[PDB]
Amino acid sequence: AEDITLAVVTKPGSAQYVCAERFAQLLAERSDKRFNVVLHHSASLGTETDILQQVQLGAVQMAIVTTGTLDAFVPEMAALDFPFLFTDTTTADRVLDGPVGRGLLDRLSTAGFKGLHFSENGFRHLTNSIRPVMTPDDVRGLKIRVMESQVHRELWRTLGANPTPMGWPIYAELQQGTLDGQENPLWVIAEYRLNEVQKHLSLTGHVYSTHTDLANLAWFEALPANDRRLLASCMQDAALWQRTWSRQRDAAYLEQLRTAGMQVIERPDIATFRQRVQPLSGSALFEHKGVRKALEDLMAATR
Numbered sequence: 001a002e003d004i005t006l007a008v009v010t011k012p013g014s015a016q017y018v019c020a021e022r023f024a025q026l027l028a029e030r031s032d033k034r035f036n037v038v039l040h041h042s043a044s045l046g047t048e049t050d051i052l053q054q055v056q057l058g059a060v061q062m063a064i065v066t067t068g069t070l071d072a073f074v075p076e077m078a079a080l081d082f083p084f085l086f087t088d089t090t091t092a093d094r095v096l097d098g099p100v101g102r103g104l105l106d107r108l109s110t111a112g113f114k115g116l117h118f119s120e121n122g123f124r125h126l127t128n129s130i131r132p133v134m135t136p137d138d139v140r141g142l143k144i145r146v147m148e149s150q151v152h153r154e155l156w157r158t159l160g161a162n163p164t165p166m167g168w169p170i171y172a173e174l175q176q177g178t179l180d181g182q183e184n185p186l187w188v189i190a191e192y193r194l195n196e197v198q199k200h201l202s203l204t205g206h207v208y209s210t211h212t213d214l215a216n217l218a219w220f221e222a223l224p225a226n227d228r229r230l231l232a233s234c235m236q237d238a239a240l241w242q243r244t245w246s247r248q249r250d251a252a253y254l255e256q257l258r259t260a261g262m263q264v265i266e267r268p269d270i271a272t273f274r275q276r277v278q279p280l281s282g283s284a285l286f287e288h289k290g291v292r293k294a295l296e297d298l299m300a301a302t303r
């Protein structure tokens, strides 16, 4: 078999881990064992950002990483993590799998990646150790961890938080109180036990977060066309499979976290959240042509 190295930053039972496993399985099956996927996971290889550099270098062939982390590599990706772009998965799926998302995946070539598909991370929700949050006013001052992504730092600056970008993991900082909160989908909060270091959760659903499933461009294009097709086929089916797997578990995660004692605000002030993020579309980042046109194309597609 040819071994193919695929990295994720998270652990077994996590969303991108499950997608990768399913991919590795399907690939082994469909390729009659001509390929064998070697998953690297947890913190072996550093942050998602370190991972990307390794994939860009070719020392790792494939990875599944949170899409926001790619905007350092390809600015237009930031538009995907614009707040309240998507408010349901039906719309998200159609738009991401359709020509607009596909064109954004294609333009990852500019940074030396082949973009294969989007997979699901989830709606991100806000958590903290300081007070309940209903409105943007409630986040004033809070030291909220954000991913190493330009759009996310500016987003949370715009809402009046004091955001700090930082690679995964983050639990020690939260427990040591050095950071007041963070934000992520429900599976993350549960599977990484963030409830242990975070009293509060608000269901803001502020960003619909995807993973990007990608490969080193040069390595991928040097494969025969039938194998390039074979790999895309497997990753597309893996991503579709994992969306369903994860979405089946969301409900249970919420209840798990409730049972665990988190104080949950289930309907925070979303209209006031939306208004407060309005100036972000004139951010330094979002003034850039490529980025703004990508945002516009995405929004148009939702309608």
Ligand SMILES: CC(C)(CO)[C@@H](O)C(=O)[O-]
Pocket (backbone or CB within 6 Å): 009, 010, 016, 065, 066, 121, 147, 167, 168, 183, 184, 185, 188, 209
């Ligand atoms: C937790 C995570 C690595 C899951 O992809 C990402 O959402 C993050 O860093 O917040």
